Write an enzyme that holds these catalytic residues in place. Sequence first.
Site, mmCIF file in Angstrom:
data_model
loop_
_atom_site.group_PDB
_atom_site.id
_atom_site.type_symbol
_atom_site.label_atom_id
_atom_site.label_comp_id
_atom_site.label_asym_id
_atom_site.label_seq_id
_atom_site.Cartn_x
_atom_site.Cartn_y
_atom_site.Cartn_z
ATOM 1 N N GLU A 35 37.280 31.455 -17.714
ATOM 2 C CA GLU A 35 37.717 31.737 -16.353
ATOM 3 C C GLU A 35 39.092 32.381 -16.295
ATOM 4 O O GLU A 35 39.313 33.298 -15.527
ATOM 5 C CB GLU A 35 37.697 30.446 -15.530
ATOM 6 C CG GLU A 35 36.284 29.936 -15.200
ATOM 7 C CD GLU A 35 35.468 30.870 -14.295
ATOM 8 O OE1 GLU A 35 36.026 31.859 -13.748
ATOM 9 O OE2 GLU A 35 34.256 30.609 -14.149
ATOM 10 N N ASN A 46 37.800 38.653 -5.166
ATOM 11 C CA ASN A 46 36.361 38.904 -5.100
ATOM 12 C C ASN A 46 36.059 40.002 -4.078
ATOM 13 O O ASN A 46 36.849 40.259 -3.183
ATOM 14 C CB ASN A 46 35.640 37.597 -4.746
ATOM 15 C CG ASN A 46 36.018 36.453 -5.662
ATOM 16 O OD1 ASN A 46 36.332 35.327 -5.216
ATOM 17 N ND2 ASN A 46 36.005 36.727 -6.963
ATOM 18 N N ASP A 48 34.090 40.179 -1.620
ATOM 19 C CA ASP A 48 33.991 39.650 -0.254
ATOM 20 C C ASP A 48 35.338 39.288 0.378
ATOM 21 O O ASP A 48 35.380 38.869 1.527
ATOM 22 C CB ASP A 48 33.033 38.445 -0.181
ATOM 23 C CG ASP A 48 33.554 37.189 -0.900
ATOM 24 O OD1 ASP A 48 34.725 37.121 -1.312
ATOM 25 O OD2 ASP A 48 32.838 36.199 -1.112
ATOM 26 N N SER A 50 37.560 36.966 -0.607
ATOM 27 C CA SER A 50 38.069 35.699 -1.136
ATOM 28 C C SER A 50 38.760 35.976 -2.471
ATOM 29 O O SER A 50 38.602 37.057 -3.037
ATOM 30 C CB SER A 50 36.945 34.688 -1.309
ATOM 31 O OG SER A 50 36.038 35.056 -2.337
ATOM 32 N N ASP A 52 39.932 33.964 -6.339
ATOM 33 C CA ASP A 52 39.848 32.831 -7.254
ATOM 34 C C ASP A 52 41.237 32.570 -7.839
ATOM 35 O O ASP A 52 41.955 33.503 -8.217
ATOM 36 C CB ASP A 52 38.896 33.104 -8.419
ATOM 37 C CG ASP A 52 37.483 33.346 -7.992
ATOM 38 O OD1 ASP A 52 37.080 32.990 -6.861
ATOM 39 O OD2 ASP A 52 36.681 33.909 -8.788
ATOM 40 N N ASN A 59 37.712 29.138 -5.837
ATOM 41 C CA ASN A 59 37.536 30.232 -4.873
ATOM 42 C C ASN A 59 37.967 29.770 -3.464
ATOM 43 O O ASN A 59 37.568 28.707 -2.995
ATOM 44 C CB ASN A 59 36.063 30.648 -4.897
ATOM 45 C CG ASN A 59 35.751 31.907 -4.118
ATOM 46 O OD1 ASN A 59 36.517 32.349 -3.284
ATOM 47 N ND2 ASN A 59 34.578 32.485 -4.393
#
Length: 129
Positions: A35, A46, A48, A50, A52, A59
């Site tokens: 990660e 991301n 969309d 959002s 992380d 997220n």
Amino acid sequence: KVFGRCELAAAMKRHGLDNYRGYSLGNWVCAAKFESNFNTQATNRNTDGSTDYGILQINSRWWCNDGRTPGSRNLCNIPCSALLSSDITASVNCAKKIVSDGNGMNAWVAWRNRCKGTDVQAWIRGCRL
Ligand SMILES: [Cl-]
Ligand SMILES: [Cl-]
Ligand code: NA
């Protein structure tokens, strides 16, 4: 902070993740490796909108507040920035909520694709725990 492998395994054990929801320590270390490459300050946007955050790339769509993810939730009841700390408490406590919520560690895409089914014990091999 960029953790070393065994350093993170020890911290994660102290913070109660070893066998949390049945997931051995190596699953968590492997997840963090893929990660974030063990970097607490890792962020990724991301498509969309959002983002992380942190060593486990939690997220803002669901788990933390960053003030810029319209319509999102904050289920861990934290600012996303808390997830970037050198102190892994907020990331660990939030991850514990995530992994408890029904889908287990499948929530972490890098875990499912790169850790699940593999010899995850190799990630804690040789570490003083
Ligand atoms: Cl928001
Ligand atoms: Cl499970
Ligand atoms: Na949010």
